């Protein structure tokens, strides 16, 4: 099966990328929640 080999490679690659993404989202969501708190403390 020359197709099985190929399909397996692409799944492996995809899994790696989702890992890097779950990192980036926690850095950005952190920042957003941090701007929203400070602004609140400042303005009634």
């Amino acid at each position: 099966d020359p197709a099985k080999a190929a399909f397996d490679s692409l799944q492996a690659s995809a899994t790696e990328m989702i890992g890097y993404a779950w990192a980036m989202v926690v850095v950005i969501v952190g920042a957003t929640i941090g701007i929203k708190l400070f602004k609140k403390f400042t303005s009634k």
């Binding site: 920042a31 941090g34 403390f41």
Partner: protein
């Protein structure tokens, strides 16, 4: 009341806050908490000077 409703920020949401925070951020917050105190002492002391009208 404030002792059992207590929670702390998870450790993963730090790298974020420490990329966006200026230098005058936390210093400002403290001011908003000191202005409050001051007004409470003004209020209590202003009501003790009004007891001077109870002896008339």
């Amino acid at each position: 009341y404030l002792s059992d409703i207590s929670a702390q920020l998870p450790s993963d949401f730090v790298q974020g806050v420490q990329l966006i925070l200026p230098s005058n951020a936390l210093p400002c917050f403290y001011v908003i908490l000191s202005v409050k105190a001051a007004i409470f002492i003004f209020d209590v002391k202003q009501k003790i000077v009004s007891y001077l009208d109870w002896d008339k």
